[PDB]
Amino acid sequence: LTPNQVNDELNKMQAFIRKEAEEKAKEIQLKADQEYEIEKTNIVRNETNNID
Amino acid sequence: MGATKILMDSTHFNEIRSIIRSRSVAWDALARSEELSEIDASTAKALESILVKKNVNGKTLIPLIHLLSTSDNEDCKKSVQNLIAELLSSDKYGDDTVKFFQEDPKQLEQLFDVSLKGDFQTVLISGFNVVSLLVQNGLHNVKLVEKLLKNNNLINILQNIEQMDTCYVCIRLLQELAVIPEYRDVIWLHEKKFMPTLFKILQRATDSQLATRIVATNSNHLGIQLQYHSLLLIWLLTFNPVFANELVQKYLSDFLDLLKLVKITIKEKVSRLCISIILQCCSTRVKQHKKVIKQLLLLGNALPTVQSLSERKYSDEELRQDISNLKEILENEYQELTSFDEYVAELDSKLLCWSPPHVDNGFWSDNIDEFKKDNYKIFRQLIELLQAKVRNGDVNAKQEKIIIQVALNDITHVVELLPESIDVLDKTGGKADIMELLNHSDSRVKYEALKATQAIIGYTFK
Amino acid sequence: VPPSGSVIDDYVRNASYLEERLIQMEDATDQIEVQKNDLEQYRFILQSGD
Amino acid sequence: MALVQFYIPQEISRDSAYTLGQLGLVQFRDLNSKVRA
């Protein structure tokens, strides 16, 4: 009924959605960096053993 | 310019920085009082007006390092560290300060020497300013992170749970420093001090409901950022294979709340980091992963909570695929073992405990034919251990009821699947001892003895 | 019905063992009642025939 | 204090919002299911 409650709830919902999207993007970037690091480390270890 | 935005979009950093930026400091009174230089007070007073109205740019930052190190007031170093930290994180003003601080490591060491002294706010601002420059690609130093982590001033603010903003900023700086692989080795040594506050920060939020909006641990912006930073701090350190074994072995009791925290909370940040923390420790790249998987699944019963938590899904379906991949590796890792060798080692060890594969008829079905070596010596040894626990080691105790209920519950499947066990049970003497356990206490173990007595009574008379 | 939140996994996990124990207790009670009724029905016939 | 959620068509939001708000409901904001994450 009031006009301030829709703006306050929409601003809090938008800020919480933006923070959740930023945290999910940071977690996805960290998981992709860790998976790329292990995926490089395995083939680097195998190629280093074969070259050794 | 172009520094990272760590500790810039959080409400706790703006709330703690608002109290420092709200108050004013008289640099001219301290300079006239013989506490600071006149040029450092004029450059510090002109830096506040030039930071907003102003925005070779790093020439004015040189007198603040000598003025903050020479002076002993925490208000001037907190205000100058707050203005330098606010000007350093911006991308439109103070761009030469990042290049001047990144080019000269003596100014970074002099700025890091002022932090960790006096108040926790100036040590958090100086440690966040040094951690912001150390977290970039301009300069790196593990000795400053190890020496800063060895100090009780920086870890004292994060260890205290009364201030969620100071512990959240220190947890976010430890997560940003732990995001690099070189800082995880030096940061992994002091994980015992930060692990109890991170475990109590998740257990405190999991112990309270997340329906109403309060200032405590809840579903607001502060609780999701504090729980997401606390789970992300252990999740960043869980990428190492050697750290996952010692972390899973040391924090095995506190690690069991991650499954209940994902079911209690509705956000996907706690469930994704909680499932990714057990999924990273349950990988095959860590040494001794079978002992942590068998100890967590056998001791903690993570297979039923992972099976019940695997059904409920939400957003971020990659974490649901990580939990589904961790559940198949967790159940497939322990279920792939031999039931006859585990039952023979468990019966030979004289320790019976309830497990996921110990209550199935498929394990006793394959072990029923292999148990017969000499007149059913396996069932006579298990019944001789169950009756021997009843003879010596008297009952109406907590210790004997677990092995008596496990042996009585395990004897019902072998007695039901094999009708020839009544001759070995009656010859060994477990039939007379099985009826005595029903009249006593332990009505769960008395119900297992009623099930074994009903199974023997079903084959004894039709 | 309380006003606070609830979990279906705690109710299903708290009800599965009670349902399995109630089904096993009902089957064992029915089999023990059928065997006791058969032996009690055959006891007087065995004593009268003996 | 408690989170309440209701669903209805977008033709009686004023009448349902006035009757629901008239019994103690406060901070009523009409939204959809695709505008949140």
UniProtKB/Swiss-Prot annotation, chain A:
Region: Interaction with VMA5, residue numbers: 1-13
A Gene Ontology molecular function term of the record: proton-transporting ATPase activity, rotational mechanism
Domain of life assignment: Eukaryota
Location of region: Interaction with VMA10: 12-31
Main location: membrane
Effect of residue 2 to A: Increases ATPase activity 1.4-fold
Subcellular location: Vacuole membrane
GO terms (BP aspect): endosomal lumen acidification; Golgi lumen acidification; proton transmembrane transport; vacuolar acidification
Gene Ontology, cellular component aspect: fungal-type vacuole membrane; Golgi membrane; membrane raft; proton-transporting V-type ATPase complex; vacuolar proton-transporting V-type ATPase complex; vacuolar proton-transporting V-type ATPase, V1 domain
Keyword entries, A-Z: Acetylation, Coiled coil, Hydrogen ion transport, Ion transport, Membrane, Transport, Vacuole
Coiled-coil annotated spans: 8-38
Additional note from the record: Present with 16134 molecules/cell in log phase SD medium.
Function summary: Subunit of the V1 complex of vacuolar(H+)-ATPase (V-ATPase), a multisubunit enzyme composed of a peripheral complex (V1) that hydrolyzes ATP and a membrane integral complex (V0) that translocates protons. V-ATPase is responsible for acidifying and maintaining the pH of intracellular compartments.
Subunit structure: Homodimer. V-ATPase is a heteromultimeric enzyme composed of a peripheral catalytic V1 complex (components A to H) attached to an integral membrane V0 proton pore complex (components: a, c, c', c'', d, e, f and VOA1). Interacts with VMA5; the interaction is direct. Interacts with VMA10; the interaction is direct. Interacts with RAV1 and RAV2 components of the RAVE complex, which are essential for the stability and assembly of V-ATPase.
The family this protein is said to belong to: Belongs to the V-ATPase E subunit family.
Annotated protein name in UniProt: V-type proton ATPase subunit E
Organism (species): Saccharomyces cerevisiae (strain ATCC 204508 / S288c) (Baker's yeast)
Protein's gene: VMA4
Interval of the full protein contained in this chain: 8 to 59 of 233
Curated annotation (Swiss-Prot), chain B:
Subcellular location(s) of the protein: Vacuole membrane
Any one of the GO BP annotations: vacuolar acidification
UniProt topology in membrane: Peripheral membrane protein
A Pfam family annotated for this UniProt entry: V-ATPase_H_N
GO cellular component: fungal-type vacuole membrane; Golgi membrane; proton-transporting V-type ATPase complex; vacuolar proton-transporting V-type ATPase complex; vacuolar proton-transporting V-type ATPase, V1 domain
Keyword rRNA-binding in annotation: no
Disulfide feature: none
Disruption phenotype: Increases the ATPase activity of membrane-detached V-ATPase V1. Abolishes growth at pH 7.5 and in the presence of calcium chloride, abrogates growth at pH 5.0.
Annotated keywords: Hydrogen ion transport, Ion transport, Membrane, Transport, Vacuole
Recorded GO MF terms: proton-transporting ATPase activity, rotational mechanism
Assembly, per entry: V-ATPase is a heteromultimeric enzyme composed of a peripheral catalytic V1 complex (components A to H) attached to an integral membrane V0 proton pore complex (components: a, c, c', c'', d, e, f and VOA1). Interacts with YND1.
Protein's job: Subunit of the V1 complex of vacuolar(H+)-ATPase (V-ATPase), a multisubunit enzyme composed of a peripheral complex (V1) that hydrolyzes ATP and a membrane integral complex (V0) that translocates protons. V-ATPase is responsible for acidifying and maintaining the pH of intracellular compartments. This subunit is essential for activity, but not assembly, of the enzyme complex. This subunit is also required for silencing the ATPase activity of V-ATPase when V1 is detached from V0.
Note: Present with 22500 molecules/cell in log phase SD medium.
Family statement: Belongs to the V-ATPase H subunit family.
UniProt protein name: V-type proton ATPase subunit H
Source species of the chain: Saccharomyces cerevisiae (strain ATCC 204508 / S288c)
Gene behind the chain: VMA13
Curated annotation (Swiss-Prot), chain C:
Subcellular location: Vacuole membrane
Similarity-based family: Belongs to the V-ATPase 116 kDa subunit family.
Other comments on record: Present with 55714 molecules/cell in log phase SD medium.
First and last residues shown, out of full length: 100 to 149 of 840
Stated role: Subunit of the V0 complex of vacuolar(H+)-ATPase (V-ATPase), a multisubunit enzyme composed of a peripheral complex (V1) that hydrolyzes ATP and a membrane integral complex (V0) that translocates protons. V-ATPase is responsible for acidifying and maintaining the pH of intracellular compartments. Is present only in vacuolar V-ATPase complexes; enzymes containing this subunit have a 4-fold higher ratio of proton transport to ATP hydrolysis than complexes containing the Golgi/endosomal isoform and undergo reversible dissociation of V1 and V0 in response to glucose depletion.
Organism classification: Eukaryota, Fungi, Dikarya, Ascomycota, Saccharomycotina
Domain of life: Eukaryota
Complexes and interactors: V-ATPase is a heteromultimeric enzyme composed of a peripheral catalytic V1 complex (components A to H) attached to an integral membrane V0 proton pore complex (components: a, c, c', c'', d, e, f and VOA1).
PTM remark: Glycosylated.
Identification of the protein by name: V-type proton ATPase subunit a, vacuolar isoform
Chain coiled-coil ranges: 18-46
